[PDB]
Amino acid sequence: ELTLDPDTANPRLILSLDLKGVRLGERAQDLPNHPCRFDTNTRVLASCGFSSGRHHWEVEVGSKDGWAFGVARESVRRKGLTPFTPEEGVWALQLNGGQYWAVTSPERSPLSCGHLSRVRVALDLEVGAVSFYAVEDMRHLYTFRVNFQERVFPLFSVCSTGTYLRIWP
């Protein structure tokens, strides 16, 4: 079962005791500045990364703005303020401005998917794709087709208070 990796987490994030949930806190924790820790962007990775095969996990999503989640290439930049874009190696859905988005670039792609509660992520490192489905009916939300060239990690980001993400098993 997937858990969030506290050594990668931006020190403003608050992880749940069971390491499944993340929200944004009001104060930066005093944590060691490991090279793998996101020091500015509000991100955390799961402790498990994948180099081959096909993998599923599910993410319970808050109803309000502030979250983005999906996958990141391991080489995603951790230090300084970085763009949240496919070019930086993040492939994600996002709730922002009251709208669900696939975070394409240079312009995001608005999704007309209706309300989301929990999303199944399907990562395929054999063919090269990451897909998102709303669990109530498995309707397709978005697929990024990517020739991944390194290990890929589940990615979570929460940039405002009042929302959350939770790995659901």
Added chain:
Amino acid sequence: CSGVTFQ
């Protein structure tokens, strides 16, 4: 002020 710059 959504904070999305820091996503």
